Amino acid sequence: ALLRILKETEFKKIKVLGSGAFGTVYKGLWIPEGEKVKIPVAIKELREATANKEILDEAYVMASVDNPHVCRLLGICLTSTVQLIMQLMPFGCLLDYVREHKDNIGSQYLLNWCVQIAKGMNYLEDRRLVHRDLAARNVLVKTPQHVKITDFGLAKLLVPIKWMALESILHRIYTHQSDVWSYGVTVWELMTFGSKPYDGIPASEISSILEKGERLPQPPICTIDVYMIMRKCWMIDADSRPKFRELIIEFSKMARDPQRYLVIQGDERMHLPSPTDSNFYRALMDEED
Amino acid sequence: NQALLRILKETEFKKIKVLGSGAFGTVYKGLWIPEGEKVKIPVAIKELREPKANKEILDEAYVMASVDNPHVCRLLGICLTSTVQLIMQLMPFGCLLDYVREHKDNIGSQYLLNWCVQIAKGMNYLEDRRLVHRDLAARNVLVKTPQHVKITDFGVPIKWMALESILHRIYTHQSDVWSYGVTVWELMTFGSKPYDGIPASEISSILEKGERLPQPPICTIDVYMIMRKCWMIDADSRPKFRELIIEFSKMARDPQRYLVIQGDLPSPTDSNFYRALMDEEDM
């Protein structure tokens, strides 16, 4: 009862928002039968085909998540392009957000985003769910103070080589510890204000340079404390990498003294919003717990 | 406290479409544009019709912004220009009065009785906060979702007023109980006008002589018994909102025993879908 089966006639796609490997996302409108209102939604149109048991069985798990930092699948319409319905996130993806606001993001926002993504990932691990596609492009901004992990369970379809752990590239092993690798790359994206990992290196070569010990470089704003966490996420031995429960504690500790661990020009100028502005955001856009 | 009311600039929101007007001004559907961002967030804007009277407005606006109950609307922001503009959350379904009129052939007893419970819960909170509504009516109950209504517009409606309010300008929580009875009558009549065609200047006379709103056709006597008790001349003899919650909740557990509707809730599937999209606040 956590996945609504929708009819073609009760929603409409109105504007294209973007695409990735698993199809196209639209801003759409849900029109409840009998009512006069139009409710904004996000619609993902898929494009892979090989069942009416495959997609639904995974969608049910997708609709079952319950964590403030994990996006929940809300509905589905089984047409020819299967359309998945979720909540609309007015701010877009975190990657573009950091790129567009890279001159307005202080250490407190960056570290709190790291904490929240780790909380969302720890939730997925607790539920025995492997993401397989964690990246800055798959973190949605609900409010600037509240981010949520998206695009989970689209393993019914198909690769993000430059975010994948070495054992995933070589052996197609996907575990929670391989998610820890992708988490490290996601943190690198945020701390570089949206740089492209291994920029200009063909994907067919990533496993080679990883085997020889090359890793993503230290972002200029990172102290050695933060970069060591990222490097530990990229250890070849998956069991030696940190766990999401541990990443929550460490990044939460750094978030209590953010200017000690990130060196950003003009940091003390940007703070978290006052309780006035957070209460205003939550009342209008973010009423969940 | 002070951080529960946002002071907005003219340049960070825009009125886009009129929704209606009431006693004190006009309500618009609007868009809030956060400074520095590209997003447009829908809001409701109430612009009054008529700097230091603003000290009056602000002192009450802070109290309006301090209420916090799942069935009570909270004032969110204010913009002080010429005419003062008040900002709250937009309710895509509108009020309960127009909703019951437009859906009067699809509303069952369970919805009606649960609405009575929820309005009573919101009023009991206001009494707990020692706040007198003074303008309770079906037109001032907003529909967040069909399963979730909230009381709005606090901080003359003769046909909703208790007799002591008409005669002596006495407003108490027990006079709110009178208005609650009239609000329940509106819902049970599917949006009928109280004392239709009777001039407001004559209402106090008919009340003193014992005339009351008639029993709605769908109302069983148990429900009409409650409504009549809300309209007793002795304000202390009327029920309390804490008691109204218990009684209407009891009837809501056997709704077809207490309301007789020709052709008489959503599945947990549909409620979970509504709440995720429109109503994440905890209740």
Ligand SMILES: *CCC(=O)N[C@@H]1CN(c2nc(Nc3cn(C)nc3OC)c3ncn(C)c3n2)C[C@H]1F
């Ligand atoms: C950042 C790159 C990216 O991930 N692109 C596409 C589209 N995605 C997406 N975006 C939003 N919110 C959004 C973006 N823009 C420009 N406007 C809005 O909202 C009005 C979103 N909300 C919910 N979901 C599921 C979204 N997806 C996902 C990628 F496919």
Ligand SMILES: *CCC(=O)N[C@@H]1CN(c2nc(Nc3cn(C)nc3OC)c3ncn(C)c3n2)C[C@H]1F
């Ligand atoms: C039933 C009595 C009445 O109609 N009073 C009008 C409506 N106003 C009002 N409406 C809404 N929600 C709403 C109304 N319509 C036609 N569309 C929507 O949503 C798109 C509302 N939300 C918050 N506030 C303060 C509202 N006021 C008030 C009177 F003008």
